[PDB]
């Protein structure tokens, strides 16, 4: 079987997984920034 | 035994990654919904 081709695809998944955890991190920071700024502007 | 055992581990590892990816995509969309709420 095409184990090279399979390792390739598995690697593509691994990359994508790390790309997503990085997206989660930015969105989370975006959210928290907005939470703080909203509170700061309410007083 | 030899080849089949290899293949099954690779399959399980791929399924575990797809499962993690799906969980993380949903997480992203849920943060995005929160962000929409904060911007409403």
UniProtKB/Swiss-Prot annotation, chain B:
<comment type="subunit">
    <text>Interacts with MLLT10.</text>
</comment>
<comment type="similarity">
    <text>Belongs to the class I-like SAM-binding methyltransferase superfamily. DOT1 family.</text>
</comment>
<protein>
    <recommendedName>
        <fullName>Histone-lysine N-methyltransferase, H3 lysine-79 specific</fullName>
    </recommendedName>
</protein>
<comment type="function">
    <text>Histone methyltransferase. Methylates 'Lys-79' of histone H3. Nucleosomes are preferred as substrate compared to free histones. Binds to DNA.</text>
</comment>
């Amino acid at each position: 079987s095409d184990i090279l081709g399979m390792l390739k695809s598995l690697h593509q998944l691994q990359v994508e997984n790390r790309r997503l955890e990085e997206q989660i991190k930015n969105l989370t920071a975006k959210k928290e920034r907005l939470q703080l700024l909203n509170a700061q502007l309410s007083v | 035994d030899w080849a089949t055992l290899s293949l099954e581990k690779l399959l399980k590892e791929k399924q575990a990654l797809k499962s993690q990816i799906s969980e993380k995509q949903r997480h992203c969309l849920e943060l995005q919904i929160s962000i929409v709420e904060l911007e409403k």
